[PDB]
């Protein structure tokens, strides 16, 4: 790896600089290098890893959507192969990023994660990047969807046993599993039920929280509420 000669701490320091500079491809390469040093990741380092790849894949998804829409309109008008070719190029790059993240989780972040906060974070991530693969998949599709579902479900079982209902990781997991149900799995009733029960149980636990934790949890709860407003 091209980061094999750089110190772990220097890679983390440069990841933080790339974030300030909005250089997210660099940020992801630095954090991949950090993971490949073989030590477990702290809470802050896990969030750097997630921020970097979420921004990289987020730009790819936005581009694939523009191009797929142009491609679909062309098949309703006048006629060549360029639109399909360039959508395939972007799609292939997107899948490579997803495969890179899933490879880091499998070698060996997940198997070394013993605490609930790290294990749930990484299993959620696995579900997320199989979900991004599913958005562009065309049968194959079914195995990818089941891999996302399986990772989210394992994360959910742990989080319900081990975390309070207002925990931001538990909330973000439930939010994203509900989006999976609505957008990927054709199960809008399951999406709605999960979002409502997640929101209601967090509401009833807010009284236990400090002012800072209260702000953290209610921020994510608002996203559950926004989705419910769109879905109903």
């Amino acid at each position: 790896g091209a980061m094999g000669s750089m110190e772990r701490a220097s890679l983390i320091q440069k990841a933080k600089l790339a974030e300030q500079a909005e250089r997210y491809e660099d940020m992801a390469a630095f954090m991949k290098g950090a993971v490949e040093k073989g030590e477990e990741l702290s809470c802050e380092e896990r969030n750097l890893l997630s921020v970097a790849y979420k921004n990289v894949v987020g730009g790819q998804r936005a581009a694939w959507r523009v191009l797929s829409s142009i491609e679909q309109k062309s098949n309703e008008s006048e006629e060549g192969p360029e639109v399909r070719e360039y959508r395939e190029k972007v799609e292939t790059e997107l899948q490579g990023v997803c495969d890179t993240v899933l490879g880091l989780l499998d070698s060996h972040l997940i198997k070394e994660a013993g605490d609930a906060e790290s294990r749930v974070f990484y299993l959620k991530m696995k579900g997320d990047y199989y979900r991004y693969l599913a958005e562009v998949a065309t049968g194959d599709k079914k195995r990818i969807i089941d891999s996302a579902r399986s990772a989210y479900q394992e994360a959910m079982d742990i989080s319900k046993k081990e975390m309070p209902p207002t925990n931001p990781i538990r909330l973000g997991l439930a939010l994203n599993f509900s989006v999976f149900h609505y957008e990927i799995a054709n199960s809008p009733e399951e999406a709605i039920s999960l979002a409502k029960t997640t929101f209601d149980e967090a509401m009833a636990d807010l009284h236990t929280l400090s002012e800072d934790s209260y702000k953290d949890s209610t921020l994510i709860m608002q996203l559950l509420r926004d989705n419910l407003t769109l879905w109903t």
């Binding site: 969030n47 997630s50 609505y182 957008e183 994510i220 989705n227 769109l230």
Partner: peptide, 8 residues
């Protein structure tokens, strides 16, 4: 309109 997923 697309559903909102978790923020950073």
């Amino acid at each position: 309109v697309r559903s909102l997923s978790e923020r950073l």
